């Protein structure tokens, strides 16, 4: 019902916005508490009230609470907005230091959010043409790898740059989205339907879904890059105690498999790269020179072949009915599983020969 304007060059300190009141900020508004403008929710066209930052205006230390809407127009700016309990920031200008404590931030085309902190139950949605940098993601993956929650955390339909994903943090990259230069700690995860470039798994997980593309993922201790059917990973580095898992119909090309790195796949996947014994490939049902250790595993399916597989400590070679593995080299701690109809031959730890055609060593 009531309406106020902060002209350019003027500054207003404090205040509360309730019952659909509106503050039109062309100057500076510091410490406003915004508790109206979003009563009907984000999917309604009939909301009224809230704080509007026009071109050249600025807001500082704003609190957005339940039903509160801070609307930042192109050319407007905010610093250190704290969003709690079902408030939201609609961003078409610039925001710095926004904290989401179960609040929403929507970044529209041309909007830019730097340093947003997504705390528990917070929700950052980046639309096509929107950009965020330096985001800290602390929520959305509380439920672990089995949780398909996408209602909290960071949803990327535009571009996210320099994101840190901490324990419990979840980033989802939709088909049109791009994440560049992401750091993912243990307990954090990133799901790729769009594109990811330069991702560091410092214990965290990256799931590459159908049509997703992950470029230059570095997998350090505890990290996990999973490539589903129809997903693609290019130029992955598997470091010690990291794992690359490529499902049937998934693709990983130009893999750098360093010593102690685990590769987990089957002969129905497509994998190429180099390991500590040179070039290796799993292509069109034929594996050559795969190195399995420290959790690595290769399933050789019916009609498929593997040659020159090194099964070293913590590696597992699993040859199904109708699969063939020749020149298998068994190291100490390596395991071979051969089902009934499997044909397997090689040499073991001892330099001694063996031939099959259930568990070995």
Residue numbers in the entry: 0 to 356, 361 to 364
Lines quoted from the article behind this entry:
Ag43 possesses a modular domain organisation that is common throughout the ATs, which encompasses an N-terminal signal sequence that directs the secretion of the protein across the inner membrane, a passenger (α) domain that is responsible for the function of the protein, and a C-terminal translocator (β) domain that facilitates the translocation of the functional α-domain to the cell surface. Similar to α43a 13, the α-domain of all three Ag43 variants folds into an L-shaped right-handed three-stranded β-helix, with each turn of the β-spine comprising three β-strands linked by loop regions.
Crystals of α43_UTI89 and α43b belong to the C2 and P21221 space groups, respectively, and each contained one molecule per asymmetric unit. The α43b truncation occurred during recombinant protein purification with cleavage occurring at residue 415, possibly by a protease mechanism that remains to be defined. Although Ag43a and Ag43b share 86% sequence identity in their respective α-domains, these proteins differ significantly in their aggregation profiles. Unlike α43a, α43b did not crystallise in its dimeric form. However, given the similarity between α43a and α43b, we superimposed two α43b structures on the α43a–α43a functional dimer13 to infer the potential α43b dimerisation interface, which consisted of two interfaces encompassing a total of 14 hydrogen bonds. To confirm if this interface was indeed responsible for the aggregation phenotype of Ag43b, we mutated residues D29, N60, R62, D79 and S95 to glycine (Ag43bmt) and tested an MS528 strain expressing this mutant protein in aggregation assays. Substitution of these five interface residues completely abolished the ability of Ag43b to mediate cell–cell aggregation compared with Ag43b WT, confirming the predicted mode of self-association. Although α43b–α43b trans-dimers are stabilised by a double-interface, this interface consists of only 14 hydrogen bonds. This reduced bonding network results in Ag43b-expressing cells displaying a reduced aggregation profile comparable to that of Ag43UTI89.
